[PDB]
Design a binder for this molecule. Structure first.
Ligand SMILES: O=P(O)(O)OC[C@@H](O)CO
Ligand SMILES: [Cl-]
Ligand SMILES: [Cl-]
Ligand SMILES: [Cl-]
Ligand SMILES: [Cl-]
Ligand SMILES: [Cl-]
Ligand SMILES: [Mg+2]
Ligand SMILES: [Mg+2]
Ligand SMILES: [Mg+2]
Ligand SMILES: [Mg+2]
Ligand SMILES: [Mg+2]
Ligand SMILES: [Mg+2]
Ligand SMILES: [Mg+2]
Ligand SMILES: [Mg+2]
Ligand SMILES: [Mg+2]
Ligand SMILES: [Mg+2]
Lengths: 228, 226
């Protein structure tokens, strides 16, 4: 019953970190279009499970982004499965997914899965280090990866700059080539001003770190793009 | 674009080989559903261009399976860009697609391109060596790759055994999990009986170099399947 082509804003939460329960409830009731749990490496199934149990009561779609096979947990509305298009390690493109289909084939069949084509464009983040991403890219390299995603018809193309604001022109040019894919942008959005700037180009903006740095300011990112 | 979900038989030609007399014409007029220009151990743009010029004049769909950016040549009805799912080198999974998009984005926009999920299941062949494929696979590994191919939205999953016949049970099992893409099988098919056998499970059977070794025998594979 979900359709990411109707979304405009999502919060992405790190189960590796702690957020007060009250704040988690407020984010779920914020008007965001989805709450995504970042199920990565360093990530534990126990933390993903606790998060699932806390957010499942809400109406908002809860999504698990599967970055580590060991941390998959049933019960989420949607499962996003990333392929890091610019990784130099086949494991982050295909490898880990093949291991998951081999070990949890029945589980993967029962879930609603959405493939994401990731382009990590911030060379200094944990994610680029983990995935062996060729993250120091020129704009034309970025646009070519978006075309690759648009060709494989992955539903989502995710331009990832994690803790830094990315070149806004890269976001604009990427959106220019994407016809059927939904463009998710994440990177340094920490307040309403920056949220609105990037939402002018991205289809969906992702707000993550800011939630833990300045909650009230990060909360305003939803009204910034979805409000009057 | 021509609909691969309606195909049953294709011939795949090596542009670095030449069929004699009027055999290429007979093959293109045979009833096969497509003629794919492939290649081995690299290919050359000039050889692909000469092949294009010969097959484009027939109604049968002509397809270029891109195995090198340097050999993309305009003029084909469809372009298949393989992603070698089981390659240990990212360049064979998404590298070809990225370079082609960066270097020839406008050409890619004007042509009809199809991503093809390849699984090289013969560890002892040029293709496995060239693509650094982890090709010594168990049937569950093959099935899992097929599941991935669909995860990645690929319209075609190609199970490749190159110069030998692959395990008929692997074909049967992969067909069983492919809910939304088309299963192409290629590897060692040279005659009607074998073509019919594999066509029982594959959506499309690919007949390759048998056309150079024994054309009359290979030509019978079309009627065998269709
Ligand atoms: O933490 P930030 O910088 O907001 O980025 C959100 C998301 O892109 C992280 O995967
Ligand atoms: Cl764990
Ligand atoms: Cl057709
Ligand atoms: Cl020829
Ligand atoms: Cl004709
Ligand atoms: Cl053969
Ligand atoms: Mg929309
Ligand atoms: Mg546990
Ligand atoms: Mg719920
Ligand atoms: Mg939009
Ligand atoms: Mg059919
Ligand atoms: Mg070959
Ligand atoms: Mg023609
Ligand atoms: Mg024509
Ligand atoms: Mg023409
Ligand atoms: Mg069929």
């Amino acid at each position: 019953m979900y359709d990411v082509t109707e979304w405009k804003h999502v919060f992405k939460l790190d189960p590796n970190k702690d957020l007060p329960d009250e704040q988690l409830e407020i984010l779920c009731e914020s008007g965001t279009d989805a709450v995504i749990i970042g199920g990565s490496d360093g990530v534990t199934e126990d933390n993903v499970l606790r998060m699932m149990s806390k957010v499942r009561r809400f109406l908002v779609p809860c999504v698990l982004e599967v970055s580590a096979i060991e941390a998959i947990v049933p019960g989420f509305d949607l499962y996003f499965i990333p392929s890091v298009l610019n990784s130099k390690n086949a494991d982050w493109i295909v490898g880990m997914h093949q291991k998951a289909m081999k070990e949890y084939g029945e589980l993967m069949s029962m879930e609603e899965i959405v493939a994401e084509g990731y382009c990590i464009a911030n060379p200094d983040c944990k994610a680029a280090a983990l995935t062996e991403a060729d993250a120091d890219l020129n704009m034309d390299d970025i646009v070519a990866y978006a075309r690759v995603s648009e060709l494989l018809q992955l539903p989502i193309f995710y331009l990832e700059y994690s803790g830094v604001l990315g070149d806004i022109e890269a976001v604009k040019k990427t959106k220019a080539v994407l016809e059927t894919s939904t463009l998710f942008y994440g990177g340094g959005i920490k307040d309403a001003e920056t949220a609105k700037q990037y939402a002018e180009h991205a289809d969906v903006i992702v707000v993550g770190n800011a939630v833990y740095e300045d909650f009230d300011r990060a909360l305003k990112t939803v009204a910034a793009v979805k409000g009057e």
